Amino acid sequence: MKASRLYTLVLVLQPQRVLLGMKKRGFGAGRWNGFGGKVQEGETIEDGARRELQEESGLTVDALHKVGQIVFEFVGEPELMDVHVFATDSIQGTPVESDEMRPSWFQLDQIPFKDMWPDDSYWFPLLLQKKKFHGYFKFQGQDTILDYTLREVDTV
Ligand SMILES: Nc1[nH]c(=O)nc2c1ncn2[C@H]1C[C@H](O)[C@@H](COP(=O)(O)OP(=O)(O)OP(=O)(O)O)O1
Ligand code: NA
Ligand code: NA
Numbered sequence: 573m574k575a576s577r578l579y580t581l582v583l584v585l586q587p588q589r590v591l592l593g594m595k596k597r598g599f600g601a602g603r604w605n606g607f608g609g610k611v612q613e614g615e616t617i618e619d620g621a622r623r624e625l626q627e628e629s630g631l632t633v634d635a636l637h638k639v640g641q642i643v644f645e646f647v648g649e650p651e652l653m654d655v656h657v658f659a660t661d662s663i664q665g666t667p668v669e670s671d672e673m674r675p676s677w678f679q680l681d682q683i684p685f686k687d688m689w690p691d692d693s694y695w696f697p698l699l700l701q702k703k704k705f706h707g708y709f710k711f712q713g714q715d716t717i718l719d720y721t722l723r724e725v726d727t728v
């Protein structure tokens with residue numbers, strides 16, 4: 573059985589648009605993602621998701637709501653990524669471009685799936701339907717899924 577490391581992912585989802593962040597630099601440049609990072613010692617997962625959103629994008633929120641949980645496994649990496657997925661419609665402030673990340677809104681008929689993580693094509697449609705989900709994806713590298721499971725759940 574592998575060990576897992578906790579991560580967060582926040583989708584800034586409004587009725588007609590979603591805010592995503594593009595990686596500007598390095599391995600994975602050009603890919604659009606929600607906002608998040610590693611959970612730190614002593615914080616709740618939800619508080620870590622809020623902190624990461626603020627650190628990564630400049631945005632604050634009053635509340636998040638949990639919408640999913642996805643485990644990622646990469647070939648060659650013994651540690652699983654346990655990603656806790658949150659969404660909010662209610663944001664404070666404007667998103668900020670950093671040296672690492674450029675934020676941009678996309679209309680919900682222009683979701684840039686080809687330039688997102690491949691798994692997003694599977695679970696983001698559930699998020700748009702206000703469904704909750706559990707997922708697992710095994711990757712060879714950044715582009716290829718070798719195995720995956722996705723299931724709608726009533727409780728995350
Ligand atoms: N397959 C995938 N699909 C997806 O939609 N988001 C993914 C993903 N794989 C990783 N992510 C997201 C999860 C999380 O928000 C982020 C990865 O977190 P990072 O390792 O960048 O965290 P930190 O910035 O805390 O790490 P440090 O490098 O240690 O500072 O990318
Ligand atoms: Na971090
Ligand atoms: Na990061």
